[PDB]
Scaffold this active site. Sequence first.
Site: not given
Lengths: 221, 219
Positions: B58, B119, B200, B31, B63, B60
């Site tokens: 990614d 989130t 991570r 990603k 528009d 997002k």
Amino acid sequence: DPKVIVAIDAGTVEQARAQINPLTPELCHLKIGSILFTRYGPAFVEELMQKGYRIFLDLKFYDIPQTVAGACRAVAELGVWMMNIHISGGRTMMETVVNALQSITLKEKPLLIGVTILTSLDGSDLKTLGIQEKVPDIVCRMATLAKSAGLDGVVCSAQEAALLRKQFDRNFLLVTPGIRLMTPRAAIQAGSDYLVIGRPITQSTDPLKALEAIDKDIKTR
Amino acid sequence: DPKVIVAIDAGTVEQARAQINPLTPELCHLKIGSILFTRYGPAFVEELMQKGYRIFLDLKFYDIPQTVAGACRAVAELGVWMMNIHISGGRTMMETVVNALQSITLKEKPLLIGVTILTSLDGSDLKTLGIQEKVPDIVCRMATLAKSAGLDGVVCSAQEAALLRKQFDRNFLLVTPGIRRVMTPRAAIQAGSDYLVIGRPITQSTDPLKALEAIDKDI
């Protein structure tokens, strides 16, 4: 400092160059959006800046605070003059970006402008987000938040500028697309600081002449 | 098909390369987000794809319909495996993007995934905009409309996956970050995740390949 920002929405770099050719940085800035940027990336923006234009890079970021701050930082380090982010992203995101841009390496800081509710959202779209109230209202609400969060202005319709200008005296930049030959003078009179103008210029038989006419119209005394 | 998408954390090209070096296209997809793409553009995405990786780009998008449609066409032409757009953008935007992707005579169809409510946002953010409805209700509704509009799935947090999976069969993808409140890979799988987005736990481990291999097994 020209008040017109010409929207370049060509799909290819060859067409973009052809649209930009007859213009002049003395008369306009340029808005480059997600189509050209996604296809060509930062390198095309760099070419345009070397031609002497200030760039409004219109990517409407809407992501978590650290990602948007990182992205806006990159845009700023590029030398870009104005950029925008969705106010929907929330206070923390906006404040985090504002804080991040204060640490950029350039002396001249880019203008950070908020997007409220896109004109492409209708009534059911607003209800999907749970917005029971309506456009003029929610826009004024987001605009206030944007200001509180330290943004330099918002993108708004001319039909919204008069309203927001009552709310915000200066400096709060009102950047207004959707101009037609709402006219340039009408928008400015309502309170717009910058006009975003596309096809009236780019699909004109003589874009330079068209751009000159708008500038002269605005400056008529 | 690997089921892990490794989130590339990095800031710089060299740092990104260092994170990617120990992985393998056999064990994961990647990603790549707005920071890396805004800094390095399509050329870096092409570099990773040439190394054999499928990419979740990614960005997002949120528009107007014709702009997002044009952007998603650029992404498809770049050969990207998965991309995402804000469901907030409206039904017309979604349907326009869906149709634009259909008209494309590319071979493999890039997966179109919807973003619901980040989130990073919660009820307190919603109320500031006069929104009184609850996040999970808005999320469920957005996911439903995405499904209706023809999107292939949504990103949802692992913490959130269990309640969402209850709404959708396996025809609709749940792509789930937020993995190590604390949600393990095992727990995310039980909850109903189709793709695990992991940062991570993999990239920062003393032996990223070791960790990755260990996760691919549990599945």
